[PDB]
Design a protein around this ligand. Structure first.
Ligand SMILES: O=C(O)C(=O)N(c1ccccc1C(=O)O)c1cccc2ccc(O)cc12
Length: 282
């Protein structure tokens, strides 16, 4: 029982202590390509880089670098591409990846501006009549429709490979209510957001992996992925009480560094899963 474990950590207020153990045990792999001088401007943060073994490679002979990692959960049979919020110069790389990986959905967990500063480039068109064109990767992006709700917004986008004239419908799932500081009050809205993404089929195997991001693509993105897999795992195994979130997180951390950046975030992940399990259980 993780809820029981939850109350023990809260009781003895040892969240920070536990988050730190996870941090210490976490994997550590080379990020050589990410550190190459040529890719300097392709990274938003100096300390957040994709391990070389799990990075996403753009299908171009020039520079195949993009700060994104493929997190493959074998047991859950769920894959996710966690990446940083694109930069002024990597928006075309970002959509090239979505196209190349055959992604159906894009999950954004932050706002373009937070705490008074740019946390992500405006990488999608805000008006139907103002489509965007990324000349470097020869891609056209069009806002087909948008649905703004209290806690999030779903956008229907059309991505066209100008080279082939081929087009695909991309679902933009944007969580707009994540607090500037700390984590959400209750996991409620977050979980609903997750289920909406699920319902879309964006997380399903008949499509490429979903593309998730916030600013660094490790903190909030990690929460989204950790929560989803754990819930899925409790839905698959014979004993849902066997799903160890700390264990799952460490497994994901073999694919990208720093998933879950704070003890608050970790605590929140527990809430999300515990609260999500009460509903998803039936
Ligand atoms: O974009 C992220 O991965 C995010 O999770 N980060 C956070 C880290 C600690 C506390 C809160 C957050 C948050 O945004 O909810 C971040 C991780 C790594 C580097 C970051 C640089 C700037 C920033 O605003 C958030 C970062």
């Amino acid at each position: 029982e993780m809820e029981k474990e939850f109350e023990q950590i809260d009781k003895s207020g040892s969240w920070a202590a536990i988050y730190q153990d996870i941090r210490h045990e976490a994997s550590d792999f080379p990020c050589r390509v990410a550190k190459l001088p040529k890719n300097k401007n392709r990274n938003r943060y100096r300390d957040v880089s994709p391990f070389d073994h799990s990075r996403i490679k753009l299908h171009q002979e020039d520079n195949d670098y993009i700060n994104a990692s493929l997190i493959k959960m074998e047991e859950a049979q769920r894959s996710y591409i966690l990446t940083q919020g694109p930069l002024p110069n990597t928006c075309g790389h970002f959509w090239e990846m979505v196209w190349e990986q055959k992604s159906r959905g894009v999950v954004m967990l932050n706002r373009v501006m937070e705490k008074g500063s740019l946390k992500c480039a405006q990488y999608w068109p805000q008006k139907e009549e103002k489509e965007m064109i990324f000349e470097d990767t020869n891609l056209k992006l069009t806002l087909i429709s948008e649905d703004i709700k209290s806690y999030y917004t779903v956008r229907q986008l059309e991505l066209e490979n100008l080279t082939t004239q081929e087009t695909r419908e991309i679902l933009h799932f944007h969580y707009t209510t994540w607090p500037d500081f700390g984590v959400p009050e209750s996991p409620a809205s977050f979980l609903n957001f997750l289920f909406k993404v699920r319902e879309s089929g964006s997380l399903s195997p008949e499509h490429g992996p979903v593309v998730v991001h916030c600013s660094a693509g490790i903190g909030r993105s990690g929460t989204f992925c950790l929560a989803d897999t754990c819930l899925l795992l409790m839905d698959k195994r014979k004993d849902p009480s066997s799903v160890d979130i700390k264990k799952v997180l460490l497994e994901m951390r073999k694919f990208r560094m720093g998933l879950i950046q704070t003890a608050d975030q970790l605590r929140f992940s527990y809430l999300a899963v515990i609260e999500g399990a009460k509903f998803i259980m039936g």
